[PDB]
Amino acid sequence: EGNSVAGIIKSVNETSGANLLSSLKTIKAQAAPIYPAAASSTGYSTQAKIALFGALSWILYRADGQSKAHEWIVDLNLNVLQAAWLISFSSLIPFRAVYFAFRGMAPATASTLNGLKTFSSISL
């Protein structure tokens, strides 16, 4: 895969003057980058099924031994207390403000890229 500017330079050099201005949208699109198209689902990967069966195999096994733990009704009522905060965190955390607050932790996303200021790289 050669570079697309040498593909632009070649495709503009071997056109004529009459069909130059018509060819400029098919030389533009021949050198556009590939953004791969949204394929069909094929949902829940072979590892997303291990992650959900293995988490269900863990939650059932932990609730099995919680139910015979000599404080079994206190153990099973702590999962209600612990899952009550997972519900209150979905309803109280500002998830767009948290997303943009983690973007400021990283200096790569806290600013814009900064090089190559367009007046230095002209070709007139």
Binding site: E71, I73, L81, W85, S88
Partner: protein, 97 residues
């Protein structure tokens, strides 16, 4: 259905715009929504405690009761604070009941 694609869209519109804070009115009684969540939280605990107890009610409690008895039991195996004692009384009660 597609098993990952139906109820993901059902849970999405149960999560987001399904709101019993406004569909059941409820701004008439509650000041903010930050205190509707702060007692839906405590409401989830009180409901979950009362479901976990009632789903198996005739049980001798592992936790210390404070000197209280549930209903008309008061001397049975359900209220007996000695556990090897109440195991004997439960096995007698189970033949009758």
């Amino acid at each position: 259905m597609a098993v990952t694609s139906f109820l993901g869209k059902a849970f999405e519109k149960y999560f987001y715009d399904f709101s019993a804070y406004e569909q059941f009115g409820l701004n008439r009684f509650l000041s903010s929504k930050g205190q509707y969540v702060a007692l839906r939280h405590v409401g989830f605990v009180m409901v979950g405690v009362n479901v976990l107890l009632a789903a198996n009610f005739p049980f001798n409690p592992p936790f210390p009761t404070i000197g209280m008895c549930p209903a008309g039991w008061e001397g049975t195996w359900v209220c007996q604070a000695d556990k090897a004692k109440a195991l004997e009384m439960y096995k007698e009660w189970k033949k009758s009941n």
